[PDB]
Write a protein that binds this ligand. Sequence first.
Ligand SMILES: *[C@@H]1O[C@H](CO)[C@@H](O)[C@H](O)[C@H]1NC(C)=O
Ligand code: NA
Lengths: 258, 32, 4
Amino acid sequence: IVEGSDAEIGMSPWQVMLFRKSPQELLCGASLISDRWVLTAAHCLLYPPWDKNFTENDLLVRIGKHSRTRYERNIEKISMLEKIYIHPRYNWRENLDRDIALMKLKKPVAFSDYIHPVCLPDRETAASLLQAGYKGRVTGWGNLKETWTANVGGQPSVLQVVNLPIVERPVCKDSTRIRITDNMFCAGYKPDEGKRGDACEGDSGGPFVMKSPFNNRWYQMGIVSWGEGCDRDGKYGFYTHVFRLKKWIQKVIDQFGE
Amino acid sequence: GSGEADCGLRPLFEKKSLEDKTERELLESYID
Amino acid sequence: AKPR
Ligand SMILES: *[C@@H]1O[C@H](CO)[C@@H](O)[C@H](O)[C@H]1NC(C)=O
Ligand code: NA
């Protein structure tokens, strides 16, 4: 996260870390949406340009973490993966269209002060909160600045958080040459808006969330998907439109129990 | 206990009627 | 494409 700040304890209890077993590194962010279902970007699991094609056994997830580095004794939890599900119409060749994937935990995780699922948006919530100018929240353990390894196959000690405004669709389109689809939205400040902030390398797959004024519940509206660099003037972060792919999500989940 | 029944309500915040340092900023954007 |  660029130009964000230290998250508070338990501020984002649905935050999930995606790890490679061997060699041991942090790959992507993710989110807990039930006691056994984790949500992330498809390109975290499958991206052929970078020889990326992780199976279940390659990965484990860490839930309820705050520090990137230190072990949190009776706070954080290590979960294994039973099955990986990537959107069948996911398109990595062109624009990361439908950049979304579900991961099922081998065993259900137990909820705590630090581990708790985020809500999936319904139409009403999606209709109300998905408006330009309205702000959502992005969290992750990614880089604090854009590095030379960006968009190619320092770092915070604790979880980072930034709030960013949803951007008007035509502005998003004019900011990039990539064909954007309505399975995406983009967020971030405009050059003359003064404020700054963006997701960065390692924040991929993490949650873009918004708090409903109607029921005080946090809803995940987006997944950190792609962006040209980090926190560049005139560029914006692009996010997987969760509600527009919710039908797929539910279909996967209903066949193997939430 | 499976998820969706109490989802989105944080134990250390919503449950305890406490707000985080910046959630205000979000609500302001939804109103103003 | 282009993921960070
Ligand atoms: C991904 O790798 C698995 C084995 O790890 C292989 O069976 C599968 O064909 C690959 N899929 C793609 C889309 O490359
Ligand atoms: Na920007």
